[PDB]
Amino acid sequence: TPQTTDAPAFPSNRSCPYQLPDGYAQLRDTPGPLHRVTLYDGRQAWVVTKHEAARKLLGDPRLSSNRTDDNFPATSPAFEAVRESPQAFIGLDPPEHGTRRRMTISEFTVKRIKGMRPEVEEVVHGFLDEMLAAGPTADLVSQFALPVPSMVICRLLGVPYADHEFFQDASKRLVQSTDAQSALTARNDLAGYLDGLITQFQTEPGAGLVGALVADQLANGEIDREELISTAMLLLIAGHETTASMTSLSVITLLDHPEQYAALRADRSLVPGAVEELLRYLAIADIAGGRVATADIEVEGQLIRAGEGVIVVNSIANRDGTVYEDPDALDIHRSARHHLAFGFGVHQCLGQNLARLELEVILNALMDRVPTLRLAVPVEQLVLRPGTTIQGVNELPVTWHHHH
Ligand code: HEM
Ligand SMILES: N#C/C(=C1/SC[C@@H](c2ccccc2Cl)S1)n1ccnc1
C-alpha cells in the first residue's frame, strides 16, 4: 500500500541553510498557486507557493491575521501559547490593526533609521572589538549575531540592556519551544518583566518606545496595558531573533559563494542589493505566513472556503522562476525587487528597514575588520533549526587570522 499523499506534512526542515527543503522544491515545481498540506495535528490547510498569488492573497482582507481564531493554521503545539494570549497588531485586522500599528511607526521611519546608523555602527564595532580582542575560535551567534540586534532593539524600546541575559533567554525559549507549556512560560516571563517596566515608567517617564506608549496612549486609555505588553514583546522578540538569523545565515551563505563574497568586498555599493538578494534567498520567516479565511476565495480555479487555514510560504514564493530567473542561484547582482521575505500589504514587516540597515552595517564591518573570517566547522556539521520556527543556526563556530 503506497504512502504517497496529496497533502504532504508541513512544514519541512532545511537540510542546507540556504536551500529549499526537498519537499518545498516539490511544491515550488507543482503548477498552481495553492497546494494542500497536513499540519502537525492532522488538520488540512492550504499553502500558497507562487509569487504573484502570494502577493494577491496577502493583500486580500478575506484572509484574516487573527491568531485567536480556532481555525488559524497552527504549525506546532507551541502555537497554542499564542492562540490563548493577548494580541499585538501582527494578529489584528483592519481597522484595529491600523490604530495599534500607528502607535509604533514613528520609531521605524526612514529618518529615524538614518539617524540610527552611527549608533548601529558603534554597537557592531563594539562587539567586534571584544570578539577580535579575545581571538578565535568563537561562536558568532552568542558573541556577535545576537548581541548586536539585542542592544539596538533594547535602546529603541527603552528596555534596559542590563537585563539582556533574562530576555534573550526568554525570547529564545518563546520562539523555539516545541511545546505549548514551555512557550507559555517564556511568554509569561516576558510579560511580567514588561509589566514592571510600565509601572516604573508611570513613576518616572522613560525613554524609548515603551516609555512613549506609557506616557501617551496608555495614559489616554487608547491602548490596554496588556496590549502594550504584547506589542513591546512582539518588537523585542522580532528585534532579537530575525536579524541575528540573517547575520549567521548570510555569513554561511556568502562563505559558500566566495566569488560573490569577493565581488561584494571589492565594491561596497553592491551591499544593499546583496542584502535584498540574501533576504529573498534565505527567507527566514515562513512562520509569519499564517492566515484564516473569513469568506470563500476563488484562486485561479481553486476554492479556499471560509474557515480554512492558508499559509503564505514566502520562501517558496521567493523561488518562483517566473519572477527570479534561475531562482535557486544566489546572485547578488540580480534584481531581487518585490521579494516577499518581509511580507506584503498592511502587515509588511514594520522593522524591514532597521533589518536592512543592520545587515548592511554588519556585512561591511565583517568585510572591513575580519576579511579572514571562515567557519571553524564544516557546513554539514551545523545544526539547523526546524521549519516550525525562524530559520537559522543556534551556534556558528568561526575562526580568523588573530592579529595581536
Ligand atoms: C530579516 C529580518 C526580518 C524578517 C525576514 C521579517 C519578516 C517579517 C514578515 C514576513 C512579516 C509579515 C507577517 C505577516 O504578514 O503576518 C513581518 C511583520 C512584522 N515584523 Fe518583521 N522581519 C524581520 C525583522 C524585523 C525587525 C528587526 C522588527 C523590529 C521590531 C520586526 C517587526 C515586525 C512587526 C512588528 C511585524 C508586524 C507588522 C504588522 O503586522 O503590521 N521585524 N516581519
Ligand atoms: N510572525 C512573526 C514574527 C514574530 S516575532 C514574535 C513571534 C512570537 C511567537 C510566539 C509567541 C509570541 C510572539 Cl510575540 S511572531 N516576526 C519575525 C520578524 N518579524 C516578525
Side-chain angles (χ1 to χ4, degrees):
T1 170
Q3 299 284 123
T4 289
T5 176
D6 61 357
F10 183 93
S12 300
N13 300 332
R14 290 190 189 175
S15 56
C16 171
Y18 52 82
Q19 287 166 0
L20 288 189
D22 288 0
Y24 285 15
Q26 176 77 64
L27 295 171
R28 189 266 305 278
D29 295 340
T30 303
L34 307 177
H35 204 282
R36 303 173 180 97
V37 296
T38 305
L39 305 182
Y40 77 96
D41 66 344
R43 297 187 311 116
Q44 277 203 2
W46 293 105
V47 293
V48 189
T49 63
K50 307 296 185 299
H51 183 273
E52 186 49 41
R55 264 173 84 110
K56 182 171 184 171
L57 284 171
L58 284 169
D60 190 337
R62 291 172 297 187
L63 281 189
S64 169
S65 291
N66 174 14
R67 303 182 293 187
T68 76
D69 190 288
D70 290 333
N71 294 320
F72 195 89
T75 57
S76 77
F79 185 87
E80 304 302 336
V82 200
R83 154 111 163 280
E84 57 155 22
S85 297
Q87 208 69 202
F89 56 85
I90 198 169
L92 300 173
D93 301 320
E96 297 77 20
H97 167 255
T99 68
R100 293 316 188 262
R101 175 168 167 130
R102 65 186 38 112
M103 303 180 174
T104 68
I105 58 179
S106 62
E107 307 284 348
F108 299 91
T109 72
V110 294
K111 193 177 179 183
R112 179 83 59 160
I113 297 322
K114 176 193 178 75
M116 291 175 78
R117 171 183 298 277
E119 155 197 348
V120 173
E121 297 184 350
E122 178 185 10
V123 171
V124 163
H125 287 277
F127 284 100
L128 282 182
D129 281 352
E130 168 167 26
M131 186 184 83
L132 299 177
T137 291
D139 166 28
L140 194 68
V141 181
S142 58
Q143 305 304 301
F144 176 76
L146 199 277
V148 165
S150 179
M151 177 166 290
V152 174
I153 198 66
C154 285
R155 204 51 83 168
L156 182 152
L157 291 177
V159 163
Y161 186 77
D163 294 316
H164 63 269
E165 298 201 23
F166 160 77
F167 50 72
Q168 287 169 188
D169 179 86
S171 172
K172 176 178 164 61
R173 289 185 276 123
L174 181 41
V175 153
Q176 301 199 26
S177 293
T178 47
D179 60 282
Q181 175 181 289
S182 299
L184 230 162
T185 293
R187 170 78 163 69
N188 298 333
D189 290 341
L190 281 180
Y193 174 73
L194 294 162
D195 188 71
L197 194 58
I198 288 160
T199 292
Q200 183 186 112
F201 284 168
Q202 291 173 324
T203 304
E204 187 61 50
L209 179 54
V210 175
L213 296 168
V214 170
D216 187 0
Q217 281 90 357
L218 185 61
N220 281 266
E222 293 174 335
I223 187 171
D224 300 338
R225 182 172 193 108
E226 300 62 42
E227 290 183 288
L228 211 169
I229 292 170
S230 294
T231 300
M233 190 182 311
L234 173 57
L235 295 175
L236 182 77
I237 292 164
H240 276 75
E241 305 299 335
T242 357
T243 46
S245 293
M246 278 306 295
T247 293
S248 304
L249 288 177
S250 295
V251 167
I252 294 166
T253 304
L254 289 166
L255 291 169
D256 264 16
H257 301 76
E259 296 186 19
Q260 289 184 66
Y261 197 25
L264 190 60
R265 188 169 202 280
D267 179 359
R268 306 304 179 86
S269 78
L270 301 174
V271 170
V275 171
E276 295 307 296
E277 176 64 347
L278 287 162
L279 288 165
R280 175 195 77 89
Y281 201 70
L282 295 171
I284 62 177
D286 285 324
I287 176 195
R291 297 296 190 267
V292 60
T294 61
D296 291 353
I297 306 160
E298 316 181 53
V299 185
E300 300 175 49
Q302 311 182 258
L303 218 198
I304 301 174
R305 305 183 268 111
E308 289 196 288
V310 180
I311 304 181
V312 183
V313 187
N314 60 73
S315 69
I316 297 176
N318 280 352
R319 305 298 189 96
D320 188 332
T322 68
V323 185
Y324 307 106
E325 199 181 2
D326 307 294
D328 299 338
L330 182 74
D331 180 1
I332 61 171
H333 310 271
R334 79 160 71 243
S335 174
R337 302 188 59 77
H338 303 281
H339 70 77
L340 287 170
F342 292 121
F344 171 86
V346 297
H347 293 282
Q348 178 159 340
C349 178
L350 179 67
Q352 59 183 323
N353 293 324
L354 179 61
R356 287 178 169 111
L357 169 66
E358 287 170 346
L359 188 56
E360 170 268 307
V361 172
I362 284 166
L363 291 176
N364 274 312
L366 291 179
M367 293 186 289
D368 283 349
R369 310 263 316 266
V370 217
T372 63
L373 186 68
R374 67 194 178 264
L375 300 193
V377 296
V379 167
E380 294 80 351
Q381 283 176 22
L382 301 168
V383 177
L384 315 184
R385 297 176 191 151
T388 48
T389 190
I390 296 174
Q391 307 285 344
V393 297
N394 279 336
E395 320 173 358
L396 185 55
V398 294
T399 186
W400 59 89
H401 186 91
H402 182 47
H403 291 94
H404 180 82

